[PDB]
Amino acid sequence: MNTVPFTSAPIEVTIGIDQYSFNVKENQPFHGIKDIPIGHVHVIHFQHADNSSMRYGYWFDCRMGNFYIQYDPKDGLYKMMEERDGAKFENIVHNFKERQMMVSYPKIDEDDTWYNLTEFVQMDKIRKIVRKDENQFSYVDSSMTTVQENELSDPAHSLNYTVINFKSREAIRPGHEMEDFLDKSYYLNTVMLQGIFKNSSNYFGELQFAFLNAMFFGNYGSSLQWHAMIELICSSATVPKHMLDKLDEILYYQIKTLPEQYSDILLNERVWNICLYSSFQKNSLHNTEKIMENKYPELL
Amino acid sequence: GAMNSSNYAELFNNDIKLFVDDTNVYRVTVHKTFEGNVATKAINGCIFTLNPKTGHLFLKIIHTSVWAGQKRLSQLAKWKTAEEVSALVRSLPKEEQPKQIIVTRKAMLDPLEVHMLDFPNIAIRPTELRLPFSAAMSIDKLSDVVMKATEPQMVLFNIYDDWLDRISSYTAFSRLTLLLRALKTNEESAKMILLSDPTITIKSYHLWPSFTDEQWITIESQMRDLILTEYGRKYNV
Ligand SMILES: CNC(=O)CN(c1cccc(Cl)c1)S(C)(=O)=O
Ligand SMILES: CNC(=O)CN(c1cccc(Cl)c1)S(C)(=O)=O
Ligand SMILES: CNC(=O)CN(c1cccc(Cl)c1)S(C)(=O)=O
Ligand SMILES: CNC(=O)CN(c1cccc(Cl)c1)S(C)(=O)=O
């Protein structure tokens, strides 16, 4: 079990660690989060109490280094850092643990939610979407735009998701215009899976990361990407059976975890109604269709 | 953006543009079978592609053989339209290619955009205008060439005859749309109006009669009356 220690909490903030959120008061004896499960990526995220427009966070994997959070009073945010001195960092964490100055990652043993939301998400792929090569962790916030959003304004601060555009030469073979527009299998299987992503695990990893960014930061660009990657599969008549079965599981857990009070903004009516009721895969997503119809029947 | 009443004069500026109407691409007669079921028989159709500034009508005849063995023909017809328009654009010299294509039915937007991906600078636009180009098959000479075709063919027509020697494009398009609206509302009456004076002949290479300026004013009035007449017959007004 690993630990993300904190300098202090000088400003009142809601702190998220994966799917949990807790409040820290201004100048409260708060030094961090312990018992973080090894083997998964994680996200530690923030919402300042005095400015709700300040929502940002860091994707990290504790197997890649020792990370700490330190408030920067000049830039006005909680920053993730790396301590290279392992001895000193292990000692720092031991002192905080002894003083009971850390909250404990509250994972229930029966619960596989975080694994199920991050099954295909890998830190190495995160670091290609979010380019900042001098750090081993990745910063994301609410306002960061995607490469595709920028094409339609600072490149170093963009989300480099794979561009998906159904009315593009990449998506449409000359001479197969109607075929490729009405059945996107070529674009899914040859262009995206074989060509760009190399395998379905990488495709699902980006899909899962996009969903989590949208849900944790209200990052509009991530929401657009998540739905586009769903629609590309659902709009393909020829999809491997194992990918469809895995997609159903992926989306079930995404819909299950989504905060009910954000469903109106996080779920695009057109895409979901199309995907569950009109598309080639309208009968392939049984678990997802069941949870959607029972939890959000209005949207449909 | 969409073409409407407010930006109507844009049709007659010097940016080359084409209207595309697909109404008459896929045409059928519905009939009973020997077992008492219903079936369709296709008949030849046409794409109506018109430059409203010059009167140029590139009438691509759609021969029934293109539907053989195909499914979902009403959907295929939109894609075949877009395929043929794209082919026409590619056949024209660069300085004759349109800067905008206006589709009369919004269901043509995606088929045409996808076929024109190689032409990112040609704008594909819908319209809020209710244009009467479906009535093109009420022009006798156009219907005749469509129905006699035994293979795919492109037939060229100027839909304004020589009117542009005497009137502007705006006035020519208005006359054309009035004539087509009349033919769409009451084809028999409209053709009677156009042919009431047999002394006014249609030239061999023309589509409409050789009316004088004064005669066109009378004809246009008679077509307006016809349209109002039919409006009252329909709505009991
Ligand atoms: C005031 N700045 C700090 O305390 C930063 N330091 C630190 C390193 C790892 C974890 C924590 Cl939590 C703090 S250090 C080494 O300077 O003490
Ligand atoms: C009972 N209120 C709570 O916040 C309890 N929770 C929690 C509390 C502190 C830290 C963390 Cl990581 C979680 S939880 C697990 O239900 O979200
Ligand atoms: C256009 N809306 C935005 O840029 C921001 N919003 C948003 C909307 C839909 C999905 C997502 Cl993730 C974010 S928000 C947080 O204001 O509701
Ligand atoms: C000139 N050859 C024709 O058959 C008649 N015309 C024409 C019609 C449609 C398209 C083209 Cl490209 C030319 S015209 C120039 O006389 O008005």
Coordinates of C-alpha atoms and ligand atoms in Angstrom, one line a residue:
Chain A
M1 CA 0.0 0.0 0.0
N2 CA 1.3 3.4 -1.0
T3 CA 1.0 7.0 0.2
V4 CA 0.8 10.5 -1.3
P5 CA 1.9 12.8 1.6
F6 CA 1.0 16.6 1.7
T7 CA 3.0 19.6 2.9
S8 CA -0.1 20.9 4.7
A9 CA -3.6 22.2 3.6
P10 CA -3.3 26.0 3.7
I11 CA -6.5 26.6 1.8
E12 CA -9.9 25.0 2.3
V13 CA -10.4 22.4 -0.5
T14 CA -12.4 19.4 -1.5
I15 CA -9.9 16.6 -2.2
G16 CA -10.8 13.7 -4.5
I17 CA -8.7 10.4 -4.7
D18 CA -10.3 8.3 -7.5
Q19 CA -14.1 8.0 -6.9
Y20 CA -14.0 9.5 -3.3
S21 CA -14.2 13.2 -2.3
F22 CA -13.7 14.7 1.3
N23 CA -13.3 18.2 2.6
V24 CA -10.3 19.8 4.3
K25 CA -10.6 23.0 6.2
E26 CA -8.2 25.9 5.9
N27 CA -5.1 25.1 7.9
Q28 CA -6.5 21.8 9.1
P29 CA -3.5 19.0 10.4
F30 CA -4.0 17.2 7.1
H31 CA -0.8 15.5 5.7
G32 CA -2.1 13.1 3.1
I33 CA -3.6 9.8 1.8
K34 CA -2.3 6.4 2.8
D35 CA -3.2 2.8 1.9
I36 CA -3.5 3.6 -1.8
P37 CA -3.9 0.3 -3.8
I38 CA -0.9 -0.7 -5.8
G39 CA -1.4 -1.9 -9.4
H40 CA -3.7 0.8 -10.7
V41 CA -3.3 4.3 -11.9
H42 CA -4.9 6.9 -9.6
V43 CA -6.1 10.5 -9.7
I44 CA -5.9 13.0 -6.9
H45 CA -8.0 16.0 -7.6
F46 CA -9.0 19.3 -6.1
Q47 CA -11.8 21.9 -5.9
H48 CA -11.1 25.0 -3.9
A49 CA -13.8 26.0 -1.5
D50 CA -13.5 29.7 -2.4
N51 CA -13.4 29.3 -6.2
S52 CA -15.4 26.4 -7.7
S53 CA -13.8 27.3 -11.2
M54 CA -10.5 25.9 -9.7
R55 CA -10.9 22.1 -10.5
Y56 CA -7.6 20.3 -11.4
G57 CA -5.7 17.1 -10.5
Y58 CA -3.0 14.7 -11.2
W59 CA -2.9 11.2 -12.6
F60 CA -0.1 9.1 -11.1
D61 CA 1.1 5.5 -10.4
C62 CA 3.0 5.1 -7.2
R63 CA 5.1 2.3 -8.7
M64 CA 6.8 5.1 -10.8
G65 CA 8.1 7.2 -8.0
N66 CA 7.5 8.8 -4.6
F67 CA 5.0 11.8 -5.0
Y68 CA 3.9 14.5 -2.6
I69 CA 1.4 17.4 -2.8
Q70 CA 2.7 20.9 -1.8
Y71 CA 0.5 24.1 -1.9
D72 CA 2.1 26.9 -4.0
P73 CA 1.0 30.3 -2.8
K74 CA 2.2 32.0 -5.9
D75 CA 0.4 29.9 -8.5
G76 CA -2.4 29.3 -6.0
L77 CA -2.8 25.5 -6.3
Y78 CA -1.9 22.2 -4.8
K79 CA 1.0 20.8 -6.9
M80 CA 2.3 17.3 -7.2
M81 CA 6.0 16.8 -6.9
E82 CA 8.5 14.0 -6.8
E83 CA 10.9 13.5 -3.9
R84 CA 14.0 11.7 -5.3
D85 CA 15.4 10.9 -1.8
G86 CA 13.6 7.6 -1.0
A87 CA 15.0 7.3 2.6
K88 CA 13.8 10.9 3.5
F89 CA 10.4 10.3 1.9
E90 CA 9.8 6.9 3.6
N91 CA 10.8 8.6 6.9
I92 CA 8.5 11.6 6.2
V93 CA 5.5 9.2 5.5
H94 CA 6.3 7.1 8.6
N95 CA 6.2 10.3 10.9
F96 CA 2.8 11.3 9.4
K97 CA 1.5 7.8 9.8
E98 CA 2.6 7.7 13.5
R99 CA 0.9 11.1 14.2
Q100 CA -2.4 9.9 12.5
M101 CA -2.1 13.0 10.2
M102 CA -3.3 11.0 7.1
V103 CA -6.7 9.7 5.9
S104 CA -6.9 6.1 4.8
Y105 CA -8.0 5.2 1.1
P106 CA -11.4 3.7 2.0
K107 CA -11.5 0.8 -0.4
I108 CA -14.2 -1.8 0.5
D109 CA -12.9 -5.3 0.0
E110 CA -15.9 -6.5 -2.1
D111 CA -15.6 -3.4 -4.3
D112 CA -14.0 -3.6 -7.8
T113 CA -15.2 -0.2 -9.0
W114 CA -11.8 1.5 -9.5
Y115 CA -10.3 -1.5 -11.2
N116 CA -13.4 -1.7 -13.5
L117 CA -13.1 2.0 -14.4
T118 CA -9.3 1.8 -15.1
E119 CA -8.9 -1.7 -16.4
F120 CA -7.2 -0.6 -19.6
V121 CA -5.8 2.7 -18.4
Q122 CA -2.0 2.8 -18.4
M123 CA 0.2 5.7 -17.1
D124 CA 2.5 5.4 -20.1
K125 CA -0.5 6.1 -22.4
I126 CA -1.8 8.9 -20.2
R127 CA 1.6 10.6 -20.6
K128 CA 1.2 10.6 -24.4
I129 CA -2.2 12.2 -24.2
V130 CA -1.0 14.7 -21.6
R131 CA 2.6 15.8 -22.7
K132 CA 4.9 17.0 -19.9
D133 CA 7.8 14.6 -20.1
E134 CA 9.8 16.0 -17.2
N135 CA 7.2 14.7 -14.7
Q136 CA 6.1 11.1 -14.2
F137 CA 2.5 12.3 -13.3
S138 CA 0.1 14.2 -15.4
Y139 CA -1.9 17.3 -14.7
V140 CA -5.4 17.7 -16.0
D141 CA -8.0 20.5 -15.3
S142 CA -11.6 21.5 -16.4
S143 CA -10.5 23.9 -19.0
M144 CA -7.8 22.1 -21.0
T145 CA -8.8 21.7 -24.7
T146 CA -8.3 18.8 -26.9
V147 CA -6.3 18.8 -30.1
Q148 CA -9.5 18.3 -32.0
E149 CA -11.1 21.2 -30.2
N150 CA -8.1 23.4 -31.1
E151 CA -8.5 22.5 -34.8
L152 CA -12.0 23.9 -34.9
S153 CA -5.1 27.6 -28.1
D154 CA -1.8 26.7 -26.4
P155 CA -0.4 23.4 -27.8
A156 CA 1.7 22.4 -24.8
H157 CA -1.4 22.4 -22.6
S158 CA -3.7 20.3 -24.8
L159 CA -5.3 16.8 -24.4
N160 CA -3.8 14.8 -27.3
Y161 CA -6.7 12.3 -27.7
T162 CA -6.9 10.5 -31.0
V163 CA -8.9 12.5 -33.5
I164 CA -12.1 10.8 -34.6
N165 CA -14.2 12.6 -37.3
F166 CA -16.9 10.6 -39.2
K167 CA -16.9 13.0 -42.1
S168 CA -13.1 13.0 -42.9
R169 CA -11.0 11.3 -45.5
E170 CA -9.5 9.2 -42.8
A171 CA -12.9 7.8 -42.1
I172 CA -14.1 7.3 -45.7
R173 CA -12.4 5.3 -48.4
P174 CA -12.7 6.9 -51.9
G175 CA -15.4 4.8 -53.7
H176 CA -16.8 3.4 -50.5
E177 CA -18.5 6.7 -49.4
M178 CA -22.0 5.3 -48.5
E179 CA -20.6 2.0 -47.2
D180 CA -18.1 3.6 -44.9
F181 CA -20.4 6.4 -43.6
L182 CA -23.3 4.0 -42.8
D183 CA -21.1 1.2 -41.5
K184 CA -17.9 2.4 -39.7
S185 CA -16.2 -1.0 -39.5
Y186 CA -13.3 -0.1 -41.8
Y187 CA -12.6 3.0 -39.8
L188 CA -12.8 1.2 -36.5
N189 CA -11.0 -2.0 -37.3
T190 CA -8.4 -1.0 -40.0
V191 CA -7.8 2.7 -39.4
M192 CA -8.1 2.9 -35.6
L193 CA -7.6 -0.5 -34.1
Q194 CA -5.0 -1.9 -36.5
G195 CA -3.5 1.4 -37.6
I196 CA -3.4 3.9 -34.6
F197 CA -4.2 2.1 -31.4
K198 CA -2.7 -1.3 -32.4
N199 CA -5.1 -3.3 -30.2
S200 CA -8.4 -2.9 -28.4
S201 CA -6.9 -2.6 -25.0
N202 CA -5.3 0.7 -25.9
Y203 CA -8.6 1.9 -27.5
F204 CA -10.5 1.1 -24.3
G205 CA -7.8 2.7 -22.2
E206 CA -8.2 6.0 -24.0
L207 CA -12.0 5.7 -23.8
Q208 CA -11.8 5.1 -20.1
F209 CA -9.4 8.0 -19.5
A210 CA -11.6 10.3 -21.4
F211 CA -14.7 9.3 -19.4
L212 CA -12.8 9.8 -16.1
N213 CA -11.5 13.3 -17.1
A214 CA -15.0 14.5 -18.0
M215 CA -16.5 13.1 -14.8
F216 CA -13.8 14.4 -12.5
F217 CA -13.0 17.8 -14.0
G218 CA -16.0 18.7 -16.2
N219 CA -13.5 18.7 -19.2
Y220 CA -15.9 19.1 -22.2
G221 CA -13.2 17.8 -24.7
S222 CA -13.0 14.5 -22.8
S223 CA -16.8 14.1 -22.8
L224 CA -16.7 14.6 -26.6
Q225 CA -14.0 12.0 -27.0
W226 CA -15.7 9.4 -24.8
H227 CA -18.9 9.6 -26.7
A228 CA -17.1 9.6 -30.1
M229 CA -15.3 6.4 -29.2
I230 CA -18.6 4.7 -28.1
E231 CA -20.3 5.8 -31.2
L232 CA -17.6 4.5 -33.5
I233 CA -18.0 1.0 -32.1
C234 CA -21.8 1.1 -32.0
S235 CA -21.9 2.4 -35.6
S236 CA -19.7 -0.5 -36.9
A237 CA -21.6 -3.6 -38.1
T238 CA -18.4 -5.8 -37.7
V239 CA -16.9 -5.8 -34.2
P240 CA -15.2 -8.7 -32.5
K241 CA -17.4 -10.4 -29.9
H242 CA -14.9 -9.9 -27.1
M243 CA -14.7 -6.2 -27.7
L244 CA -18.5 -5.8 -27.6
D245 CA -18.7 -7.9 -24.4
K246 CA -15.9 -5.8 -22.8
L247 CA -17.5 -2.5 -24.0
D248 CA -20.7 -3.5 -22.3
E249 CA -18.8 -4.0 -19.0
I250 CA -16.9 -0.8 -19.4
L251 CA -19.9 1.3 -19.9
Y252 CA -22.0 -0.4 -17.2
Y253 CA -19.4 0.6 -14.6
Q254 CA -19.2 4.1 -16.0
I255 CA -22.9 4.6 -15.9
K256 CA -23.0 3.0 -12.4
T257 CA -20.5 5.4 -11.0
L258 CA -21.6 8.6 -12.7
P259 CA -23.0 11.1 -10.1
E260 CA -26.8 11.1 -10.6
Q261 CA -26.9 14.9 -10.4
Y262 CA -24.5 15.3 -13.4
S263 CA -26.3 12.8 -15.7
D264 CA -28.0 15.6 -17.6
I265 CA -24.6 17.1 -18.6
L266 CA -22.4 13.9 -18.8
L267 CA -24.7 11.7 -21.1
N268 CA -25.4 12.9 -24.7
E269 CA -29.0 12.0 -25.5
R270 CA -28.4 11.6 -29.3
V271 CA -25.4 9.3 -28.9
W272 CA -26.9 7.0 -26.3
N273 CA -30.3 6.7 -27.9
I274 CA -28.6 6.0 -31.2
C275 CA -26.2 3.5 -29.6
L276 CA -28.8 1.6 -27.6
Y277 CA -31.8 1.7 -29.9
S278 CA -30.8 2.4 -33.5
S279 CA -27.2 1.2 -34.1
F280 CA -25.8 -2.1 -35.3
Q281 CA -25.0 -2.9 -31.7
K282 CA -28.4 -1.9 -30.2
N283 CA -28.7 -5.5 -28.9
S284 CA -25.1 -6.1 -27.9
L285 CA -24.9 -4.0 -24.7
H286 CA -27.4 -5.7 -22.4
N287 CA -25.9 -4.7 -19.1
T288 CA -25.4 -1.1 -20.2
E289 CA -29.0 -0.9 -21.6
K290 CA -30.4 -2.3 -18.4
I291 CA -28.6 0.1 -16.1
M292 CA -29.4 3.1 -18.3
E293 CA -33.1 2.3 -18.6
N294 CA -33.4 1.8 -14.8
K295 CA -31.2 4.8 -13.7
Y296 CA -31.8 7.4 -16.5
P297 CA -35.0 6.5 -18.3
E298 CA -35.7 10.2 -18.9
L299 CA -32.6 10.8 -21.1
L300 CA -34.1 8.0 -23.4
Chain B
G1 CA -25.5 28.6 -43.6
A2 CA -29.0 27.9 -45.0
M3 CA -30.2 29.8 -48.0
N4 CA -33.5 31.7 -47.3
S5 CA -35.6 34.8 -48.2
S6 CA -33.1 37.0 -46.5
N7 CA -30.0 36.0 -48.6
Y8 CA -31.9 35.3 -51.8
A9 CA -30.0 37.8 -53.9
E10 CA -26.8 35.8 -53.3
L11 CA -28.1 33.4 -56.0
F12 CA -27.4 35.9 -58.7
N13 CA -23.9 37.1 -57.7
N14 CA -20.8 36.1 -59.5
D15 CA -19.8 33.1 -57.2
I16 CA -20.6 30.0 -59.2
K17 CA -23.2 27.9 -57.5
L18 CA -25.5 25.0 -58.2
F19 CA -28.8 23.9 -56.9
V20 CA -29.2 20.1 -56.6
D21 CA -32.7 18.6 -56.4
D22 CA -33.0 14.8 -56.0
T23 CA -36.8 14.5 -55.9
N24 CA -37.0 12.7 -59.2
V25 CA -34.0 10.4 -58.9
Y26 CA -35.9 7.4 -57.6
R27 CA -39.3 7.1 -59.2
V28 CA -41.7 4.2 -59.0
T29 CA -45.2 3.0 -59.9
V30 CA -47.0 1.0 -57.2
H31 CA -49.1 -1.9 -58.3
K32 CA -50.8 -5.1 -57.2
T33 CA -49.2 -8.5 -57.8
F34 CA -51.1 -11.6 -58.9
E35 CA -51.3 -12.8 -55.3
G36 CA -52.8 -9.5 -54.3
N37 CA -49.6 -8.1 -52.7
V38 CA -48.1 -4.7 -53.6
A39 CA -44.9 -4.2 -55.5
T40 CA -43.1 -1.3 -57.1
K41 CA -41.7 -0.9 -60.6
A42 CA -38.9 1.7 -61.0
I43 CA -39.1 4.1 -63.9
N44 CA -36.2 6.3 -65.2
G45 CA -35.4 9.4 -63.1
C46 CA -33.1 12.3 -63.2
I47 CA -30.9 14.6 -61.0
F48 CA -31.8 18.3 -61.5
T49 CA -28.6 20.3 -61.1
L50 CA -29.0 24.0 -62.0
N51 CA -26.9 27.1 -62.1
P52 CA -29.4 29.8 -61.2
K53 CA -27.3 32.6 -62.6
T54 CA -26.8 31.2 -66.1
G55 CA -29.8 28.8 -66.7
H56 CA -27.4 25.8 -67.1
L57 CA -29.2 22.5 -66.2
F58 CA -27.0 19.4 -66.0
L59 CA -29.8 16.8 -66.2
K60 CA -28.2 13.4 -65.3
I61 CA -30.7 10.7 -66.3
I62 CA -30.9 7.9 -63.8
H63 CA -31.7 4.7 -65.8
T64 CA -33.6 2.0 -63.9
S65 CA -30.7 -0.4 -64.4
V66 CA -28.8 1.4 -61.6
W67 CA -31.3 0.0 -59.1
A68 CA -31.0 -3.6 -60.1
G69 CA -30.3 -5.9 -57.2
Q70 CA -29.9 -3.0 -54.8
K71 CA -31.6 -2.7 -51.4
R72 CA -33.0 0.4 -49.6
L73 CA -33.3 2.3 -52.8
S74 CA -34.6 5.5 -51.3
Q75 CA -31.4 5.7 -49.2
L76 CA -29.2 4.6 -52.1
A77 CA -30.7 7.3 -54.3
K78 CA -29.4 10.1 -52.1
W79 CA -25.9 8.6 -52.3
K80 CA -26.1 8.0 -56.0
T81 CA -27.1 11.6 -56.4
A82 CA -24.2 12.8 -54.4
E83 CA -21.9 10.4 -56.4
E84 CA -23.0 11.9 -59.7
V85 CA -22.8 15.5 -58.5
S86 CA -19.3 14.9 -57.3
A87 CA -18.4 13.3 -60.6
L88 CA -19.8 16.4 -62.4
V89 CA -17.8 18.8 -60.3
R90 CA -14.6 16.8 -61.0
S91 CA -15.4 16.8 -64.7
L92 CA -15.5 20.6 -64.9
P93 CA -12.4 22.8 -65.3
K94 CA -11.3 24.3 -62.0
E95 CA -12.6 27.8 -63.0
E96 CA -16.1 26.3 -63.7
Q97 CA -16.4 24.4 -60.5
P98 CA -19.0 25.7 -58.0
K99 CA -18.1 27.5 -54.8
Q100 CA -21.3 26.4 -53.2
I101 CA -23.8 23.6 -53.8
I102 CA -27.3 24.2 -52.4
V103 CA -29.4 21.0 -51.8
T104 CA -33.2 21.4 -51.9
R105 CA -33.7 18.6 -49.4
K106 CA -31.7 18.4 -46.1
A107 CA -31.3 14.6 -46.4
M108 CA -28.8 15.3 -49.2
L109 CA -26.4 17.2 -46.9
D110 CA -24.4 14.3 -45.4
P111 CA -24.3 12.2 -48.7
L112 CA -23.0 15.2 -50.6
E113 CA -20.6 16.4 -47.9
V114 CA -19.0 12.9 -47.8
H115 CA -18.7 12.6 -51.6
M116 CA -17.1 16.1 -51.7
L117 CA -14.5 15.6 -49.0
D118 CA -11.8 16.2 -51.7
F119 CA -13.3 19.7 -52.1
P120 CA -13.2 21.2 -48.6
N121 CA -13.7 24.7 -50.1
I122 CA -17.0 24.0 -51.8
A123 CA -19.7 24.9 -49.3
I124 CA -22.7 22.4 -49.1
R125 CA -25.7 24.3 -48.0
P126 CA -29.4 23.6 -47.3
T127 CA -32.3 26.0 -48.0
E128 CA -35.4 27.2 -46.2
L129 CA -37.0 27.9 -49.6
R130 CA -39.7 25.5 -50.9
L131 CA -38.6 25.3 -54.4
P132 CA -40.7 23.6 -57.1
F133 CA -38.0 21.8 -59.0
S134 CA -39.8 18.4 -58.6
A135 CA -42.0 19.7 -61.3
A136 CA -39.2 19.6 -63.8
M137 CA -40.7 16.4 -65.2
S138 CA -43.7 18.4 -66.2
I139 CA -41.6 20.2 -68.8
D140 CA -42.4 18.0 -71.8
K141 CA -39.1 18.0 -73.5
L142 CA -37.3 17.0 -70.2
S143 CA -39.7 14.3 -69.4
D144 CA -39.3 12.9 -72.9
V145 CA -35.5 12.6 -72.8
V146 CA -35.7 11.0 -69.4
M147 CA -38.4 8.4 -70.4
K148 CA -36.7 7.5 -73.7
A149 CA -33.2 6.9 -72.2
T150 CA -32.0 3.3 -72.5
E151 CA -28.8 3.9 -70.5
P152 CA -27.3 6.4 -68.1
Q153 CA -26.8 9.8 -69.8
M154 CA -26.2 13.4 -69.1
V155 CA -28.4 15.8 -71.2
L156 CA -27.6 19.5 -71.2
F157 CA -30.4 22.2 -71.1
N158 CA -30.6 25.9 -70.6
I159 CA -33.8 26.2 -68.5
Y160 CA -34.1 30.0 -69.3
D161 CA -34.0 29.5 -73.1
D162 CA -32.7 33.0 -74.4
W163 CA -34.5 35.0 -71.6
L164 CA -31.2 36.4 -70.3
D165 CA -30.8 38.4 -73.5
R166 CA -33.7 40.5 -72.3
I167 CA -34.0 40.1 -68.5
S168 CA -31.7 39.6 -65.5
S169 CA -31.0 36.3 -63.8
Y170 CA -33.1 37.4 -60.8
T171 CA -36.2 37.9 -63.1
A172 CA -35.4 34.7 -65.0
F173 CA -35.3 32.6 -61.8
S174 CA -38.5 34.2 -60.6
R175 CA -40.2 33.3 -63.9
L176 CA -38.9 29.8 -63.8
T177 CA -40.0 29.2 -60.2
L178 CA -43.5 30.7 -61.0
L179 CA -43.9 28.4 -64.0
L180 CA -42.7 25.3 -62.0
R181 CA -44.9 26.2 -59.0
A182 CA -47.9 26.5 -61.4
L183 CA -47.1 23.2 -63.1
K184 CA -46.8 21.5 -59.7
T185 CA -50.1 22.9 -58.4
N186 CA -52.2 22.2 -61.6
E187 CA -50.2 20.8 -64.4
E188 CA -53.1 20.6 -66.9
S189 CA -54.2 24.2 -66.3
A190 CA -50.6 25.5 -66.5
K191 CA -49.9 23.7 -69.8
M192 CA -53.2 25.0 -71.1
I193 CA -52.1 28.5 -70.3
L194 CA -48.7 28.0 -71.9
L195 CA -50.2 26.5 -75.1
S196 CA -53.5 28.5 -75.3
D197 CA -52.0 30.5 -78.3
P198 CA -50.5 27.8 -80.7
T199 CA -49.1 30.7 -83.0
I200 CA -46.4 31.2 -80.2
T201 CA -44.2 28.2 -80.9
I202 CA -41.5 26.5 -78.8
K203 CA -38.2 26.6 -80.8
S204 CA -36.7 23.1 -81.6
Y205 CA -33.8 23.8 -79.0
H206 CA -36.0 25.6 -76.4
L207 CA -38.1 24.4 -73.6
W208 CA -40.8 27.1 -73.3
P209 CA -42.7 29.2 -75.9
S210 CA -41.3 32.2 -77.7
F211 CA -43.3 34.8 -75.8
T212 CA -42.8 38.5 -76.3
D213 CA -42.1 40.7 -73.2
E214 CA -45.7 41.7 -73.2
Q215 CA -46.9 38.1 -73.6
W216 CA -44.7 37.0 -70.7
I217 CA -46.4 39.5 -68.4
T218 CA -49.8 38.1 -69.4
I219 CA -48.6 34.5 -69.0
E220 CA -47.1 35.3 -65.6
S221 CA -50.4 36.9 -64.5
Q222 CA -52.3 33.8 -65.7
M223 CA -50.0 31.6 -63.7
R224 CA -50.4 33.6 -60.5
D225 CA -54.2 33.4 -61.0
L226 CA -53.9 29.6 -61.4
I227 CA -52.0 29.3 -58.2
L228 CA -54.5 31.5 -56.3
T229 CA -57.4 29.6 -57.9
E230 CA -56.0 26.2 -56.8
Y231 CA -55.3 27.7 -53.3
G232 CA -59.0 28.6 -53.0
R233 CA -60.1 25.2 -54.4
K234 CA -57.9 23.4 -51.9
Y235 CA -58.8 25.4 -48.8
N236 CA -62.4 26.3 -49.7
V237 CA -61.6 30.0 -49.6
Ligands
LIG1 C1 7.8 22.6 3.0 N1 8.3 21.8 1.9 C2 8.4 20.4 2.2 O1 8.1 20.0 3.2 C3 8.8 19.6 1.0 N2 9.4 18.4 1.6 C4 8.7 17.3 1.5 C5 9.2 16.1 0.8 C6 8.4 15.0 0.7 C7 7.1 15.0 1.2 C8 6.7 16.1 1.9 CL1 5.1 15.8 2.4 C9 7.5 17.2 2.1 S1 10.8 18.6 2.3 C10 11.6 17.4 1.8 O2 11.3 19.7 1.9 O3 10.5 18.4 3.6
LIG2 C1 -18.6 9.9 5.6 N1 -18.0 10.9 4.8 C2 -16.9 10.6 4.1 O1 -16.4 11.4 3.4 C3 -16.5 9.2 4.1 N2 -15.8 8.8 2.9 C4 -14.4 9.4 2.9 C5 -14.1 10.2 4.0 C6 -12.8 10.6 4.2 C7 -11.9 10.3 3.2 C8 -12.2 9.5 2.2 CL1 -11.0 9.2 1.1 C9 -13.5 9.0 2.0 S1 -16.4 7.9 1.6 C10 -15.3 6.7 1.7 O2 -17.5 7.4 1.9 O3 -16.3 8.8 0.6
LIG3 C1 -19.8 23.4 -22.8 N1 -19.7 23.0 -21.4 C2 -18.5 23.1 -20.8 O1 -17.5 23.4 -21.5 C3 -18.4 22.8 -19.4 N2 -19.4 21.9 -18.9 C4 -19.6 20.6 -19.5 C5 -20.7 20.3 -20.2 C6 -20.9 18.9 -20.7 C7 -20.0 18.0 -20.3 C8 -18.9 18.4 -19.6 CL1 -17.7 17.3 -19.1 C9 -18.7 19.7 -19.2 S1 -20.1 22.2 -17.5 C10 -19.1 21.6 -16.4 O2 -20.0 23.6 -17.3 O3 -21.3 21.6 -17.5
LIG4 C1 -23.8 25.0 -74.8 N1 -24.3 23.6 -74.8 C2 -25.6 23.3 -74.5 O1 -26.0 22.2 -74.6 C3 -26.5 24.4 -74.0 N2 -25.9 25.2 -73.0 C4 -25.4 24.5 -71.8 C5 -26.3 24.0 -70.9 C6 -25.9 23.4 -69.8 C7 -24.6 23.2 -69.5 C8 -23.7 23.7 -70.3 CL1 -22.1 23.4 -69.8 C9 -24.0 24.4 -71.5 S1 -25.8 26.8 -73.4 C10 -24.2 27.2 -73.1 O2 -26.0 26.9 -74.7 O3 -26.6 27.5 -72.5

